[PDB]
């Protein structure tokens, strides 16, 4: 039962987002910090069940120029792929 929190109002860069995920998800130190690295971590590293709570999504969507959406898309595809991931968008 792994829990991960993202306070959107505090994300000022796509890099902020990837470094935040690295910590909240306990990703490997070599974490590529990109969409492909994220898919690999969610499907071949991260522990489940997983609960991702993304607060102020809209605000973080601004400072990442729709990059936040692409990140969210990976979590959703990992989910549709079988990963026990609960996503909270608030």
């Amino acid at each position: 039962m792994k829990k991960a929190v993202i306070n959107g109002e505090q994300i000022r860069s796509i890099s902020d987002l990837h470094q935040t995920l690295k910590k909240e998800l306990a990703l490997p130190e070599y974490y590529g910090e990109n969409l492909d690295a994220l898919w690999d971590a969610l499907t071949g590293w991260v522990e489940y069940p997983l609960v991702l709570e993304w607060r102020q999504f809209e605000q973080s969507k601004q400072l990442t120029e729709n990059g936040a959406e692409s990140v969210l898309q990976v979590f959703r595809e990992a989910k549709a792929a079988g990963a026990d991931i609960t996503i909270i968008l608030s």
Partner: protein
């Protein structure tokens, strides 16, 4: 066990498939694999994850209508997975990454 960049690369080109020491993520799971445990070697000795579709999400690899990409772990023996992967396409273009997909190098 063939799990080096050129060993797997040459094998893919010559036999149009991965060596026998490779199993997909779902196959490994059916065998008891729990990524967060790093027990792959315990559940499937000599095996490495590989063969799954690679979505090329950052668009770093050459995309073409009808071409699908797949990936496989390189230099893995046991424990937690590393940052090395070999990427191969349906029309046999071969690339590698050693920095968890940040950058790629064409090797075939």
């Amino acid at each position: 066990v063939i799990n080096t960049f050129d060993g797997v690369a040459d094998y893919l080109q010559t036999y149009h498939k991965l060596p026998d020491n490779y199993i997909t993520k779902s196959e490994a799971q059916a065998l008891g694999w729990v990524a967060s445990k790093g027990n792959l070697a315990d559940v499937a000795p000599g095996k490495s994850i590989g063969g799954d579709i690679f979505s090329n999400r950052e668009g770093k690899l050459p995309g073409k209508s009808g071409r699908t990409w797949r990936e496989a772990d390189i230099n893995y023996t046991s424990g937690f997975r590393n940052s090395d992967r070999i990427l191969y396409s349906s029309d046999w273009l071969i690339y590698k990454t050693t920095d968890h997909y940040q950058t790629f190098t064409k090797i075939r």
